Design a protein around this ligand. Sequence first.
Ligand SMILES: [Zn+2]
Lengths: 156, 157, 146
Amino acid sequence: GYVPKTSLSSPPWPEVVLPDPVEETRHHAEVVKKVNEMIVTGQYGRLFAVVHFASRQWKVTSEDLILIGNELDLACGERIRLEKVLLVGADNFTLLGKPLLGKDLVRVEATVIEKTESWPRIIMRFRKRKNFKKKRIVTTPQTVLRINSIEIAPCL
Amino acid sequence: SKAVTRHRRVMHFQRQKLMAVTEYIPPKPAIHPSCLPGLIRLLRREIAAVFQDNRMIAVCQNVALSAEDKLLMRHQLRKHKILMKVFPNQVLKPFLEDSKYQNLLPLFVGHNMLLVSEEPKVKEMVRILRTVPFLPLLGGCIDDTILSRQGFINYSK
Amino acid sequence: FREVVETTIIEGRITATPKESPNPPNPSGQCPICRWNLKHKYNYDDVLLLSQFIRPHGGMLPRKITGLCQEEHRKIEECVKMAHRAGLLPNHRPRQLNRYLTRWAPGSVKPIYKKGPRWNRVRMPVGSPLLRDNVCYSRTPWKLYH
RNA sequence: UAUCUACUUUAUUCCUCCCUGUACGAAAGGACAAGAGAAAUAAGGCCUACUUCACAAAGCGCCUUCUAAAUGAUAUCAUCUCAACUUAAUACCCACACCCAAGAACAGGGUU
RNA sequence: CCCAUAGUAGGCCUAAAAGCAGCCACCAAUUAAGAAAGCGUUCAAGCUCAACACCUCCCAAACAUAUA
Ligand SMILES: [Zn+2]
């Protein structure tokens, strides 16, 4: 089944040889052990989590703010554990879940600061030659969360 | 526009998509197939009878003449009981191996005409061929012995 | 091959006959292309394949001598045309704009002064449609018209 | 009675003559090209004369006008080759006030 | 790519019209060339074919190679 080396003999992409799963699962065990040592001995600096709060993914560090487009029905000042964190990164490692991380691994806290309304937000409809002109003004409720801490735990 | 028109009417676009999706697809084999693997017996009986007839044979390249010139050669050899035979070498190459002529297999190719004989007037035939500065004598074979043209000088003389 | 040596004397000398490699991987193929698993796997780029079918003054060899397929003789004939014009056969001369994939003879093509409407646009031929059935390792096939 | 858009200094031909009444044809016939001429138009100028006229502007006046071969494969001959090889824009322009051949105003030139 | 003689200038009609102005037969010789399929001649003579021997100003720019 030999073909001599022409342009179209072989495919143009170079072949990759993926490593065998014995040495590769052993290698993964080495890496997870390293990173778990960095989480034990506290080598990391500040973290960022990607959190699936509400309907969307917020990339988040500690000490910041998120404006959410609905009333959460909590009192201002209440702390909240955001579940559904799906990426956690430090300077030298990340951890990403399939699709979410373990609750025993990462803990993201956030307080409610304020519960506002939005700025007034116009909804106008108009069709020409039809005398069709409606106007509405909508303000959605909003709450602001202050992410207090992303604490990480050695559970690998 | 009517349903029958003089020009080919533009189809609706889903009509045209149906027509394109339901086109004919011919079968393709894995390997292309092209890249895979009476008069004759009249000549056999006739010329095979000429094999047993002749005691002496000769041959030339008798293509180099005119029609009336081949008529002159036909009459001047009609003066003898020698015969001249224009026949395909295509069948004559299996003729020789049938007649056990291994020295005659490298003889019969291209334009040639047999001069089958039992009585040699071939010296006088050479006397006719000496007046025309072409048409050489190709070697013959009397009684399973080959004649070179030097042998035609010796035997014909 | 044989050569005709002359000086007045003219003789013919059989000189330095090559031979094909001992093991075709597909014996009981028909064309020398078919025998070596190259039915769709050559182009105008690869000149080691093209040069074996070319007269030393650039012309093609006839189909009877090479013993090619009819299909592959037209394909090699076309690829050799497309490779002389890309300057990939510089030593097949008898004795400057860079091109490649040129279907037609460069001195024979009228310029497109009125490219048509979008539904009848005169396109520019690139490559040859004899080389449609090559192995495309892309998903989109060869665009033969630019 | 012009508001807006757009715009407002991007060499041909005829006749004559010669070459030549040669080439070519075989006789009848009869070249080209290139050259000299004379015209005409168009384009761009100009006023020495002429003419309308007169510190000037004009024309009827003058000036200038720059695809075809060989060779040759597919298809061993040949073959003009959507076969390959080889061969056949310069010019132009560029740094107060008074008079002006510059000019609607502005601008420009000159003012030794 | 070649390769073309002979009964014969087939009879009748037609000035002669011969394979080729028309009717009819369309047999035959060598190994094989039609009483003839196209040029061609008043008619001829000459040329090929079948068959014998070798076999108002164009209008996206572009781009044929990386895994759907
Ligand atoms: Zn093949």
